[PDB]
Amino acid sequence: FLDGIEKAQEEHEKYHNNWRAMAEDFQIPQVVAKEIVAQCPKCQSPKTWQMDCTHLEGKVIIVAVHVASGYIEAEVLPAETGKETAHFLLKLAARWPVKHLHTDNGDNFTSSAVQAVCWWAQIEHTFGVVESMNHQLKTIITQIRDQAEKIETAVQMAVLIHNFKRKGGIGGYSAGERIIDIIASDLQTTKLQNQISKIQNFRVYFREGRDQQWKGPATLIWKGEGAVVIQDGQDLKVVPRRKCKIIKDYGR
């Protein structure tokens, strides 16, 4: 265990690994490897979307693309006013976690209805991939046009073919597997951060071997069944539980 912590610290000193790889290799828990990463001085987006509009056969299409995976949601608008763009933004924010929106300096994107929707849904709007996605979507639309009667059915069938039937990239996945994996990794990071702060609200007085004095207040990191990992003086050490006293610390 302590040999695992020493090997992990030497391995991060050489190669600067990440905490998932160290937790899998050296068989240490995740909070300890995250603290090893958090102590390195040389080591210190999944919710950004881009929106645009286009024209196709006299219809006004609006396209929203998740940037980090290439995930497309499209719709056919009856006009190009601000209320319909605000309604499309409200549906998009109600289905996926949207935290940062990037648009161009158009008329309908600079409107009081879109600003009210961004205020109620807590989205940061920023004015300046989407043109390449519009080009690829129009190629698919002209490829499967003869199987539909209206234009909305062709738009939604092209969205389905782009999202789940086209595979590429490094691992050979589509866009839906990429966006689900990215958001799941971010969720794991936030849950681990909550556990880290809740554990680190404590304090430990420990007694060394062949001594009867209590030592300085070291910060608790991991409280096991028989072992306790503490940080003191930029050093991690493992003390057994029968030589330690854990108190609360109100030191904000």
81 forms part of the interface with a copy of itself (CB under 8 A): no
Q: Which of residues 12-71 bind Zn ion (CB under 5 A)?
A: 16, 40, 42-43
Q: Out of a copy of itself, Zn ion, none, which partner does residue 73 contact, by CB within 5 to 8 A per kind? A: a copy of itself
Q: Which of these ranges, 54-62, 104-112, 166-174, 235-243, lies near a copy of itself under the rule CB under 8 A?
A: 166-174
152 forms part of the interface with a copy of itself (CB under 8 A): yes
216 forms part of the interface with a copy of itself (CB under 8 A): no
Q: Which of these ranges, 54-62, 66-74, 214-222, 228-236, lies near a copy of itself under the rule CB under 8 A?
A: 66-74
Q: Give me the least distance between CB of 237 and a copy of itself, in Å please.
A: 25
78-87 contacts: CB < 8 A, separation 24 or more?
A: 80/53, 80/107, 80/108, 81/108, 82/108, 82/111, 82/112, 82/113, 82/114, 83/113, 84/108, 85/109, 85/111, 85/113, 85/114, 86/111, 86/113, 86/114, 86/116, 86/117
Q: Which of residues 95-124 bind a copy of itself (CB under 8 A)?
A: 95-97, 120-121
For 238, the enclosing helix (H) or strand (E) is: strand 235-240
125 labeled part of a ligand binding site: no
Q: Kindly tell me the number of DSSP H helices and DSSP E strands found in the chain.
A: 8, 10
CB of 155 closer than 8 Å to CB of 61: yes
Q: Which of 159, 204, 221, 244 binds a copy of itself (CB under 8 A)?
A: 159
Chain-centroid distance of CA 103 in Å reads: 21
Q: Which residues contact 44 (CB under 8 A, 6 or more apart)?
A: 38
Nearest to 144 by CA among 132, 162, 131, 130: 162
Residues engaged in binding Zn ion (CB under 5 A): 16, 40, 42-43
Interface positions with a copy of itself (CB under 8 A): 14-18, 20-21, 24, 34-35, 37-39, 42, 67-70, 73, 87, 90-91, 93-97, 120-121, 129, 143-144, 152-153, 156-157, 159-161, 163-173, 176-177, 180-181, 183-184, 187-188, 191-192, 194-195, 250-252
